[PDB]
Amino acid sequence: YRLKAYYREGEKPSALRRAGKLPGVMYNRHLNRKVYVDLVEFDKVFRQASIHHVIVLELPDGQSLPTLVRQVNLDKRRRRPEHVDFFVLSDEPVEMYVPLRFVGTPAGVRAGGVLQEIHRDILVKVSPRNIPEFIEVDVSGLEIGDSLHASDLKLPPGVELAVSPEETIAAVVPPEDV
Amino acid sequence: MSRIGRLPIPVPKGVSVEVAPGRVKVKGPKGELEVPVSPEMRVVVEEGVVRVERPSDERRHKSLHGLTRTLIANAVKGVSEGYSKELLIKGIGYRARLVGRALELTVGFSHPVVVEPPEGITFEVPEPTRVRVSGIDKQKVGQVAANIRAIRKPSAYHEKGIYYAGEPVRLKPGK
Amino acid sequence: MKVRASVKRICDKCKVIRRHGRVYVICENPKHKQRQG
């Protein structure tokens, strides 16, 4: 939220990304405009401002762009972003991945598993007005054998549901005994 | 944070501090001392207090400020007999009798150790169970007291050692 | 202990002193003092 933008006109940018200015591009239906953003601003807001939050982008034309992230290319033996694909949202039920989480006792806390399969809560498409910030999933009693999620009780409030599948969701794993 | 030298000297019985353009000579009611000073750092000799001033901030100006002040601060109370520096001895049958200045003492050896003192060191012996080393300068007393430590090493499973104040943290017994 | 290549702070009251070029680590109890060498 509230990040500055600039322009690119087919530059060098491997030489421009030395002082913390990684390139980018944004679009909703057209106008594939090449931009570059700042790395400590984008990284600092990108600490907690995840995929679910609409990161808005000030532009020198005076517009505030409701963007989000499409991909962050890892530098892969440097752990850095090369290029981040922004996505402007328009009057359209666009796709969203919302990091929902789990609250409650996992499996009767002493006899508890791990509950590690977050997987970014596979897909929810939404209108730009009914877009959420947080949706809650509880883990009320889910001990080791039975009581799995299986995405059957995956009715979120409103808009929308998961479109095609109901198969990828968290489960309970046994611990590591000695 | 307070760098030593950001707080002043002032000294009643106001002993004389002179220029001595590379060093510091201090003359008091009892004796005179000597403090070497780095020539780049400027200590000044104003009324009452002895000021200290450093040029810049590196690994020598930030430590020599505080070295140079504090070695004067030892010589402030040094020339007015401000050091007692006891050495209390333990032992079943240990004592330290004095003949003149060469302090012989029985520390369990086959011969009483004759301690030859240097110039300006007074072995005040009020008790057979404790002595004290006096003088003028703190280095001259602590070095000779370390030489008294050089005979007998304490904390070897039991008593019969010296501790400079008395501090048995020796170790567990061995039965 | 005694002369080791790695120096770590067992029993957190260690003080780490770099004297005469090399690293010593000292405590009250002398069975935990270390020299790096």
Partner: protein, 141 residues
């Protein structure tokens, strides 16, 4: 140790170790990850020695995740044997790894215990392997 039970061919080559990662940088399973920085090989003895050093370290909770699998047979000739006369015997399968690939991923272990556990298993490997946590650097859209 562990080994692949079936193969198309028994012996295979060595190749080179260039390339950046070819997949395996995002964690996506656990909250922490032991990521490598130098190109080398991972023997099954290095897998076992690092896997035992987790379950013996932390107990009663925390599932350990390994994302390495040895499919490359390390070929070594017997001792005091002259050159030629075919390849050597197969002793233990090794796993090729690239820099910036996450090998070991703890699960259900806290900060001050997972830094320590990944620090213990970091010394079992011949690679400078730094430790990364769960960040927002996933590949989601």
């Amino acid at each position: 140790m562990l080994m692949p039970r079936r193969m198309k061919y028994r012996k295979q080559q060595r190749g080179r170790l260039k390339g950046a990662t070819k997949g395996g940088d995002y964690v996506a399973f656990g909250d922490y990850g032991l990521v490598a920085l130098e190109p080398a090989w991972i023997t099954a003895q290095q897998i076992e020695a690092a896997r035992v050093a987790m379950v013996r370290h932390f107990r009663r909770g925390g599932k350990i995740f390994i994302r390495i699998f040895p499919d490359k047979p390390y070929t070594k000739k017997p001792l005091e044997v002259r050159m030629g006369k075919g390849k050597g015997n197969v002793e233990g399968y090794v796993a090729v790894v690239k820099p910036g690939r996450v090998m070991f991923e703890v699960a259900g272990v806290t900060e001050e215990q997972a830094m320590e556990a990944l620090r213990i298993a970091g010394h079992k490997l011949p690679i400078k392997t730094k430790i990364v946590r769960r960040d927002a650097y996933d590949e989601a859209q």
